[PDB]
Write a protein that binds this DNA or RNA. Structure first.
Lengths: 95, 59, 103, 86, 103, 95, 80, 100
DNA sequence: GGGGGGGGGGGGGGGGGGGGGGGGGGGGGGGGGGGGGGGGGGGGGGGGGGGGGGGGGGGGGGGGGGGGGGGGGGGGGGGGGGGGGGGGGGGGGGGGGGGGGGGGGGGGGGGGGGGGGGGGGGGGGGGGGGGGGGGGGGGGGGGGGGGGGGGGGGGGGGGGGG
DNA sequence: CCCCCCCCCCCCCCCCCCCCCCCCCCCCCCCCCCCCCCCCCCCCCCCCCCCCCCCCCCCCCCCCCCCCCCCCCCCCCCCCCCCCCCCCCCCCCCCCCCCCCCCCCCCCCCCCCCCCCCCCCCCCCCCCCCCCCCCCCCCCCCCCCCCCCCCCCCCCCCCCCC
């Protein structure tokens, strides 16, 4: 139809948690929206090939993790991996 | 297109089999293939070339 | 009914991210339960890292809203973010710098 | 129902604009030949980008070049742009 | 003299003043309408009768100035490597050969 | 022992029409196979990106064609397109 | 004798010659070694990440080939 | 006794010709294999290597260093020298976007 | 200019690693025909955005002139690779035990499919309100005109005495 | 020998002459427009809940191939002598930056109409799926053939030195 998905409400939530009294101009939100899409396309891409190379058809959290280790620079990878792990573990702790 | 140029490169060397070196000669030697094929060709080496200013003795 | 995001303790949309993975699938492709969860966490974390730094910069300039110029000072300013984000940031200009031999 | 023929618009990238771009790029002194060289380099860059953007436009059977067309064309050539799409 | 020598900055002083100025700002440095005609003219020579969303043209301008500015930083490194402070066509050419471009 | 598909025999056939009396070394064949796999990947990839940009699900010869115009340098593209239209035609008209 | 010094002046000198280089400063040898170390770290790190993910203990030619491709350094002739 | 000496730069040009003619590897193998294994050991222990893997790594490295020497030479020549120096390798990596 | 010593080339030759030609197989593609389902193209339809046309005014641009600066060239020097001859301990090729890399064959959490359902972003549309940038208005600087010794602080002889 | 006290000699290091009209610059201030900000539904959209597959893991089985070693072979490092080359300095002319002046074209503000494009709705040519038939390509094993490539001999040409 006409409705286009955006990550802006989610970026605002995160901005409020790190800088409660800080706003973001629309130009700036546009950049953040492109940045997020870009990173996601890159991770899904690496996860797919990764799966492919291993004759697997399922993309699991394990492929996403390796995708992340291949894409992020040293320290950003460690913190991201630990936040990824934390959210999976919590998620599965409810089921 | 590549076999045709690699094939000429080997005939002009009076040899029967196309090698990686022949493929490197044909590819770096054609503007359009060179542009299209950025991969490293294992075992191909480089096109011979010495900068004019290094070749010398001058006079 | 708890959302999958809430169930994972995240601000980024797990259901949507799961949807987008299923459609970039590849035929008989399957997407595991937790792949979207892990993805939303990486995305939310990177976003948090960039805003933390842009927000510091909009602050050292006595200003309230983050602009592309602040995003650009924050990214070029951090070795890892700079390495990860090669995109051109419209409106961000450059980091001031003049070579010592020109002064 | 009318016209206007576009010619020599590359001279619209004037010597002052090129000097401003060089200043932002940290350049202190500029030789007289830099200007025609910069124009040539910009023409090639835009030709390559406009060529791909127009190819996406036609593929989609549109007559209007969209910001998305430019953004995908910039991406294919390794020059990702954020602020319109990416 | 009478009203003595009218003040004059030495060559280079205003140029440094300029780098400080443009390096801290973010506006587009090429005039807009002339850049729009250049775009229409190159497009037209590929396919006649094309229209343009105004933001499509703005995207090409941001990309172009970001490409030129980064090319002048590299060109400036080639001049200084050669012990000059003046960039020359050969500096631009060296930067593009190493970058792997050409024309 | 599981089958590894390769383009080698088809590369060899094309070789024969081109230089009927020429051969090709093993290391050279391996390179050609890498080359063929690489080009098919860049092409299917662009073609499916084209399909997605246009909110479509079918990869038709028209996407393969625009992808070739985006991937190949002028002359190469001119002839390639020409070779493509020519195979489709000859195939469309058959039993 | 450190491993990186196994990459010797003579070998570095031969690479430069194939690179059309005529005269070499003495400091070039250590610099080339640092550069090779960084190149090899970037590539091995990616190869080994593909190995671990596949749950193997043997880095394969394909892991190296996919690592090189990821870095924009595509190699032909070793699979893939 | 036998006093015959080539002028500085003559053997060097002969080497350039010989090495641009050939395609073999130029770094001795075992030394390179050892270097690879040591660098890998910091990312994971008890690792083994297919032979074709070490070879691919050597082919990629040598193509990379040779191409880096071509740009490096261009930088030395741009500065009117014929001798490559670390600053030329540095200028060349800086422009390539590799930075280090 | 010649010799003197080398490398290099050309043509020819031989063995051997590499390549090929053969037969044989079989699970797996490949193709067929038939049936059913689905992506999509046309065809309006309506709305949204893009050239276009108008007018007014000031910042941007161009041209010009002058002088200072900077690049190029040339020379010289000390110094740093190139070349040479010499010496030698690891590397290279071949052979052999051992250990994961595949290959296989299930079964079970896990994932999908289908159906239903209750939230959940998502424009749209006034509407108020609220940061921001530009304009103004002073205020504290870094250099262009150079400047003019005046010190410490090595530095390199220099010379003479010890 | 050698060493030590002169002895200029820059040299760099403040230092002490005066900027001084821009150059920011920083604080203040105020309209303004865009950015939210509720409303307002609302198609979407993501969650649940059975119901039904299903793919992947995992142990087991298999078995090329990796590491390791020994025996055999080769590249490296070297200290030294030489000469050129990079560097440094000086000199000089040309070129480009600063400034001035005048001008105008880009900008800004409005609207407006018409293209054109998206969205939906209708329809249907086209692709998939399926089962069956069939061919079939990669592999194993084999195993004769062969193109290559190092080697050799003889000759020619080049370079360096005299």
């Amino acid at each position: 139809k006409t409705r286009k998905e955006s990550y802006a409400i989610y970026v605002y939530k995160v901005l409020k948690q790190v800088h409660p009294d800080t706003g973001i101009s629309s130009k700036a939100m546009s950049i953040m929206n492109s940045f997020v899409n870009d990173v996601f396309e890159r991770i899904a891409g690496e996860a797919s090939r990764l799966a492919h190379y291993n004759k697997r058809s399922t993309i699991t959290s394990r492929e996403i993790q390796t995708a992340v280790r291949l894409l992020l620079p040293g320290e950003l990878a460690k913190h991201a991996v630990s936040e990824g792990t934390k959210a999976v573990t919590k998620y599965t702790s409810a089921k | 297109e590549v076999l045709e140029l690699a094939g000429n490169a080997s005939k002009d060397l009076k040899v029967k089999r196309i090698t990686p070196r022949h493929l490197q000669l044909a590819i770096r030697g054609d503007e359009e293939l060179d542009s299209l094929i950025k991969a490293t060709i294992a075992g191909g080496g480089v096109i011979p070339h010495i900068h004019k200013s290094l070749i010398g003795k001058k006079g | 009914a708890v959302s999958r995001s809430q169930r994972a303790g995240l601000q980024f949309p797990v259901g949507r991210i799961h949807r987008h993975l299923k459609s970039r699938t590849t035929s008989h492709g399957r997407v595991g339960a937790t792949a979207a969860v892990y993805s939303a966490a990486i995305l939310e974390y990177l976003t948090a890292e960039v805003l933390e730094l842009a927000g510091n910069a909009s602050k050292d300039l006595k200003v309230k809203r983050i602009t592309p110029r602040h995003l650009q000072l924050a990214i070029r300013g951090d070795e890892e973010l700079d390495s990860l984000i090669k995109a051109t940031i419209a409106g961000g200009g450059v980091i001031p710098h003049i070579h010592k031999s020109l002064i | 129902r009318h016209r206007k023929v576009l010619r020599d618009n590359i001279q619209g990238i004037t010597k002052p604009a090129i000097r401003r771009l060089a200043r932002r790029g940290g350049v202190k002194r500029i030789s007289g030949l830099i200007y025609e060289e910069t124009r040539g380099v910009l023409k090639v860059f835009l030709e390559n980008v406009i060529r791909d953007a127009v190819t996406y436009t036609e593929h989609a059977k549109r007559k209007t070049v969209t910001a998305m067309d430019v953004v995908y064309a910039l991406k294919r050539q390794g020059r990702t742009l954020y602020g319109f799409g990416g | 003299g009478g009203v003595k020598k009218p003040h004059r900055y030495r060559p280079g002083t205003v140029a440094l003043r300029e780098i400080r100025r443009y390096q801290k700002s973010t506006e587009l440095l090429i005039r807009k309408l002339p850049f729009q005609r250049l775009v229409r003219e190159i497009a037209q020579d590929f396919k006649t009768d094309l229209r343009f969303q105004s933001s499509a043209v703005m995207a090409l301008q941001e990309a172009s100035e970001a490409y030129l500015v980064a090319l002048f930083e590299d060109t400036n490194l080639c001049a200084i490597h050669a012990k000059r402070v003046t960039i020359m066509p050969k500096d631009i050419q060296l930067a593009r050969r190493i970058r792997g471009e050409r024309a």
